[PDB]
């Protein structure tokens, strides 16, 4: 065995563990989610596991979807000098075209044999795994300050008397047993002798700190396009209440969509409809209020 504990400022190591674990957790959660936002009229007719596509797109490798046996299996694809042949690395096994491939972008609208590359972002300047590191430390220390604020927001009622058995019988039989009408000696024995340590310099501070945590989440959120935007259009709470500057959050949402524009180039080739929409739906009540067809009653209940 080996044991000799520090003190009870162990909490001052537990506090910094909460901050450190919050940064690690929020960082890898936020990129645990971020490669699924778009999902684009999900599997109309096309054999793509789009989850495996979007995970590949957020490590910035240019995937290439084409035909394999007329059914659109993904492949990897790493002034205008045109690409034609299957020179690139190919991830499937025997489903390779073994024939004339092409990029279907500008050779014509809708004619050439399909192997179209899809960028994550049309013009690439900085990776957004750096922006997610940029705010999560700032977010980490505001989560530190919230946790440190509510950890010292606890309150005792200090009794103050010369020690051995004068005031103990008082609080036992007449405060925590709830008793009104306790009788005492005239020796100033509650003339502000019992005192309260309060932290009312802490609870007005508490709510404003939560609002700073909240709008910093929103200021990370609208950067990476994930937004509450369309419902904010129909709710009429459009500007300076949701302090987000709508023209910037509809801006950063749009760059990721027109990065995945070459799926429309593919969609024009084989005669089908694939639009890169932007997912904001969460179900069992939204699907109920949009239909209210009695077959949807036998589906849910």
């Amino acid at each position: 065995r080996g044991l000799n504990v520090e003190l009870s400022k162990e909490i001052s190591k537990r506090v910094v563990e909460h901050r450190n674990r919050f940064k690690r957790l929020m960082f890898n959660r936020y990129l645990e989610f971020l490669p699924l936002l778009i999902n684009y009229t999900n599997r109309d007719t096309v054999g793509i596991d789009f989850i495996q596509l979007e995970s590949a797109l957020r490590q910035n490798i240019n995937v290439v979807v084409g035909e394999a046996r007329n059914k659109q299996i993904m492949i990897l694809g790493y002034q205008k000098r045109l690409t034609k042949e299957d020179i690139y690395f190919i991830v499937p096994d025997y489903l390779i075209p073994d024939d004339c491939l092409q990029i279907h972008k500008l050779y014509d609208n809708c004619m050439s044999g399909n192997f179209v590359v899809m960028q994550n972002k049309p013009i690439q300047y900085n990776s957004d795994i750096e922006i997610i590191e940029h705010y999560t430390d700032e977010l980490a220390e505001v989560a530190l300050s919230r946790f440190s604020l509510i950890m010292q927001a606890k309150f005792s009622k200090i009794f103050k008397s010369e020690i051995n058995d004068e005031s103990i019988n008082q609080l036992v039989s007449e405060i925590y047993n709830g008793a009104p009408f306790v009788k005492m000696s005239p020796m100033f024995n509650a003339d502000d002798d019992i005192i309260d340590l309060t932290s009312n310099s802490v609870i007005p501070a508490l709510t404003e700190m939560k609002r700073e945590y909240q709008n910093k989440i929103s200021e990370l959120s609208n950067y990476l396009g994930i937004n509450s935007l369309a419902v904010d259009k129909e709710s009429g709470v459009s500007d300076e209440e949701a302090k987000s500057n709508r023209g910037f959050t509809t801006s950063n949402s749009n760059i990721y969509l027109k990065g995945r524009e070459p799926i429309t180039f593919l969609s024009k080739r084989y005669g089908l409809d694939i639009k890169p929409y932007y997912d904001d739906e969460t179900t069992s009540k939204i699907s109920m209020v949009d239909t209210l067809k009695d077959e949807s009653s036998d589906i849910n209940g």
């Binding site: 046996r69 007329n70 059914k71 025997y94």
Partner: peptide, 22 residues
């Protein structure tokens, strides 16, 4: 879909041929 199915059958037949002369 039928055309795709036919294409798949043709491909499988070709693959089968490419392994045995019979």
């Amino acid at each position: 879909v039928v055309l795709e199915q036919r294409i798949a059958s043709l491909e499988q037949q070709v693959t089968t041929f490419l392994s045995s002369q019979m």
